[PDB]
Design a protein around this ligand. Sequence first.
Ligand code: MG
Ligand code: MG
Lengths: 51, 126, 126, 143, 92, 50, 46
Amino acid sequence: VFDFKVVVTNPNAISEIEDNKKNELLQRLQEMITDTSISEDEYNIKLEKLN
Amino acid sequence: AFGGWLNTQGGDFTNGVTFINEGGSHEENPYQGIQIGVDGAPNLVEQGEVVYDDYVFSDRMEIPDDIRKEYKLRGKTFAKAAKSAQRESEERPNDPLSTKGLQAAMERIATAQEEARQRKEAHREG
Amino acid sequence: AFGGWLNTQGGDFTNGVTFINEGGSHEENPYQGIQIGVDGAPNLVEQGEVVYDDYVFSDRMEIPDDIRKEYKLRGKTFAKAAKSAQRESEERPNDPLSTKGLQAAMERIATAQEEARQRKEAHREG
Amino acid sequence: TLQSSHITEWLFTIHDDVKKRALECFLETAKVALKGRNKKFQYILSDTSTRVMEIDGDEFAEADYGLVVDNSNGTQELQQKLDTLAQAALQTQTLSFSTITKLYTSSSLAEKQRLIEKDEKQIRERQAQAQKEQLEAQQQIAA
Amino acid sequence: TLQSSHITEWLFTIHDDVKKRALECFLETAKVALKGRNKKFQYILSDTSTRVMEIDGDEFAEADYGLVVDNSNGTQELQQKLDTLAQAALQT
Amino acid sequence: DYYTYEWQDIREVRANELLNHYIKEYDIPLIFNNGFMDAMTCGEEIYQCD
Amino acid sequence: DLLNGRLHMSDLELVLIKAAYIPDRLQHYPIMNSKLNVLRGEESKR
Ligand SMILES: [Mg+2]
Ligand SMILES: [Mg+2]
């Protein structure tokens, strides 16, 4: 067999420095789809993808 | 940074005494001190004093000989008395017995400084 | 194109500093200097100035010797002094320590350029 | 190959204690690296697990705190029992699918015991209020 | 012939740790190529995966963040569990 | 969710999260295999943790 | 050294050589290795 998948070693262990980095990245995506969507035409389309 | 810490085997281990060096006095510093935090918001410490669990041992005071025979102090100053009660526990930060010995040694010089604080304000007022 | 970049091994790795050359001065350019982009929408830069994190280090200014002794600069110009503090960080654009040492060293010359700017506008006002 | 595999079973049995005692001694080594300003440990641990060092005596062997490193048949029969119970709670609409994957990805038999007792408690108050809601709705139409 | 495959199992156990460490080293080389202005990594990565590079932790190893390359019997049991969980949840 | 946990369960999750990562990181099973060969040669199977 | 294919001739007799030739030295035949590789190969599969 060959399934050398990258796994999380402790998947039930979420911390605060993990949550501040997810909160920073999710605020980074909102600056993108505000700029790349043209006046609410696809703004509710991309928001359903990152929901 | 060698002040009250043990940086060995790739980590930064401490015993709780925060040596506050290298800054300067409250008059010689443009920021009036080191400003370790904001709580009392302007918490200013100088080049000689040390902190153990948000209590500061001042380097400006001296040791009265009444408060040296009792409480068994070692340094010439209250700051130098807390720098001599952590000399065992600086090299062994993860011991159970040395941490119990450090918590009790700092709780003597806490009361030894507060008695010298209460003595000085009473003589200055009267 | 060599300006603050490390174009090795088929990829274009940068440390953030934007060496803006080859254009010309503001009067020697028909378009009034190279345009980084649109924000004031005319963001104009010239052949001497460098940019780190959307802050332009001016090449027309000079270094006061009192602004040289503190903050410990090297160049004759503020933009020339950013070209010597990033000299370490050009050859290691993905080193984690060097991206900390660049963001600290570009911060000093930015505030040193600000203190040169508030000094210059006040003296011409008086 | 069952009566020949017993001749070398003296060798694995002494070996399966050194694996036990080097993993008990590795754990006490990792407990001191926590209090050493290492930022790796805030990624591999949870929010409660980072704070067990604030509560005192983290300098005392975990066998004095009720915990042993154990590879026995008592651990393995407890491990299979808590999983086949979890599929038996998966059907009969007792255990969610969001919490079955928390049981599958826990590596601890205390974490996966507290997960079963929580979601059984979570739906039992939901079935209590929904039986309470349908009874009180019956009286107010009757009233 | 199972009891002969035990004899050469010393040879396959040092092999898979070499393959595990080569893919931890390959993941780290692939990470540094991300911040090197390469338009190929936009196609094989998603919307959110390119923005992980913009966060200030990426220059270190993924084994320091809780993520290891792993082909043990821990993940092959777990991959088989999540597939029978998917088919049992597809029905009902 | 942390009210229904007990202190011996909070300690067991902290200990297992350390061991589950560091067995998977260092490949601690292969450290135990190369010591078993020194067990069947010397009689001495010695490990250092620091 | 027996597992790595080195026979020491001072260990299986008195010596009355040092050079690598079977007219005066002895060839080692690795027959102990296969029985040890069962057992370190079975510890990998438990
Ligand atoms: Mg985690
Ligand atoms: Mg694609």
